[PDB]
């Protein structure tokens, strides 16, 4: 039985190039959880508590989803590297442009996981393709929530009235279509 | 055994000053309440219901905060002084101006009570900075909370559909960032 | 009624030496629990599951302790600067010598709250050393907690069964001396 | 309405070289499934009665994943060819060698699959390819728990206490990281 770069018992050698690749997409949504925090930040400062709820929640569940890669590396006995994380935005001049940042952060995110994905079947790694299917499913499912909230609050037109409203929809976990 | 000022066993005198100062901290509180009182007036003779509950309900536990200054004398052995009540502000010209003052008078509170405490620090008296600190922390949470209502009714800017979301979320209970 | 920096009403200003020492602070936790995590990978490499679980709840609790500040600035209208996370470090010689970063981390931490509340104290800001006083008792029972796990692994001496034995210990969740 | 080999309704063909090597496969899983029995048999001549117990439950899981195979060909309407059955090895000088042999087989188990996979693509039989994801997905998880049972057998470095303390882990059910 062989050893694998982190020293567990190897079941199947992984490319480094889709190591690599890995480890930089758990940067990406370690970065996209620190990013939901500045969000709720932002939301908070200014009463917004909904918002600032669901996006408190955001960030706590992308930190998970992040977890959730290193344990694959685990698994597949590679090397974890976990690195610099770097600051994230924290100004927006309004929620429909804070909103817009996170529906691109969330396409984003997916595009990363494509891009693992591409060079997983590149490898014939059957393995991670697998590993990463639900990832994309929910991937979708997240791009549609996003997508919904932020055309809710493009609807509103910036009026206050109207951003309470969907202010209390989030505060309740109303969060998707339906 | 020494008897104390009110006539009880005395465990430690307190200085005259810290003494006047506490006795003066009880005005300020009492007088806080009959403010939340008016408030709640002002509210309810224009149909904000919600923010007559909200401010009928700060009055009543203003005045807990107070008697539980008059506890902690009397557990000092101190006398208390129950003095004159001023009348309170009534009039304001919005409530947006209203939420104003009420911030204002919570901030105010807790200045005097850091006021007590620095002269407790200066006199040592250590019973009376562990008497305060649960007070101050509950005075953050009020100014915290009642930023939160302030900042909430100026989004509104006025508008009465808003304010009358506002006003429904006050009946319901929601009053802080969640 | 003044604004904060954040855009609050302000219920009273913070010194910017004092509010630049909070955010660095919550730099100091952020770091503890990217620190953890890295640290529970480490020993799920090893096939120590019981620390693994440990470590990974850890890194939990002590990004929320950093949360717990963000929200203390927001409730003094402050403004909030997430910075820069560093890499963490993940490569140790011995369980041993991951317990000892462990608690010297903890201790460190500790250290970084001392000098934020010695800071306060010159600046007469009795909001922030009542809102820190909590946070060092629970930095108290952390010290407590992971000197007592410190030691244990020590007393293992390096033993592989003992170390099984104190892996089994944390998985069931006994953490800490009753 | 065109009839398969099996006789079934035939809802789309497939390529002779995929079934071979489907049928191959689930001889690997009898293969697999015989082989834990005789480990569930080591283990109890040598009173490891928590091994016993754990070989003994994944004997009978081995087997439901070829029959799980078997259905799957039933339900392609192809013929199933059950095929002679080796005996498996019986002899091992440690408990650590016999577990290398179980995280090996398991790899195997999970590179036959992924042949299966690669010549499914190859033949574009789309409905093969979705049958077996789940099925890595599994492998992939039997993997990272029997790098866990090696490694920690691997740790306990031959010590019969240690060996001890893991055979009771595994007659309680912790068979995996946490």
Redesign the interface.
């Known amino acids: ?1 062989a050893q694998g770069p ?4 190897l ?2 050698s992984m490319n480094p190039d889709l190591l690599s690749a890995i480890q930089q997409h758990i940067s990406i949504e370690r970065y996209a959880s ?1 990013t939901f ?2 969000m709720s ?1 932002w939301c ?4 917004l ?2 918002f ?2 669901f996006f ?1 929640g955001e960030a ?1 569940d992308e ?1 998970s989803h992040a ?1 959730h890669f ?3 590396l ?4 590679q090397s ?9 935005r ?1 100004n927006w001049d309004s929620l429909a442009s804070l909103m817009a940042t996170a529906f691109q952060m969330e396409a984003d995110t997916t595009s990363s996981i494509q891009s693992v994905y591409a060079l997983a079947e590149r490898n ?1 790694d ?2 991670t393709t ?2 990463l ?1 639900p990832l994309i499913e929910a991937q979708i499912q997240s791009e549609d929530q996003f997508a919904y909230l932020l055309g809710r609050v493009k609807f509103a037109n910036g009026d ?2 109207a ?3 969907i202010d ?1 929809e989030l ?1 309740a976990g109303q969060t998707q279509r339906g």
Do not use: M
């Open positions: 039985v982190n020293g567990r018992a079941a199947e620190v925090l500045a930040i908070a400062e200014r009463e508590a909904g600032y709820q408190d706590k930190q977890v290193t344990q694959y685990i698994a597949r006995s974890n590297d976990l690195q610099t994380l770097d600051a994230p924290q014939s059957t393995r697998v590993f299917d206050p009235t951003l309470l409203v209390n505060r």
